[PDB]
Amino acid sequence: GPLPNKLWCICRQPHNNRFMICCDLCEDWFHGTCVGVTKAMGTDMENKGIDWKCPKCVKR
Ligand SMILES: [Zn+2]
Numbered sequence: 001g002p003l004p005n006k007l008w009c010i011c012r013q014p015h016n017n018r019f020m021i022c023c024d025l026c027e028d029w030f031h032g033t034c035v036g037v038t039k040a041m042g043t044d045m046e047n048k049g050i051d052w053k054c055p056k057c058v059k060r
């Protein structure tokens with residue numbers, strides 16, 4: 001993408017064309033790898049309307 005130095009996730013690394021998901025409390029994006037979510041899992045959650053939270057927000 002046009003902002004290769006833009007950081008995401010708990011790891012503060014770029015997108016790098018990796019699968020990412022969005023926390024519905026903080027609205028940041030997270031690499032699936034870093035938060036333990038595969039593409040199939042994330043797609044299933046999106047289909048079911050599961051309000052997935054990142055590791056910081058899930059404790060709130
Ligand atoms: Zn990450």
Ligand SMILES: [Zn+2]
Binds near residue numbers: 054056057
């Ligand atoms: Zn969050």
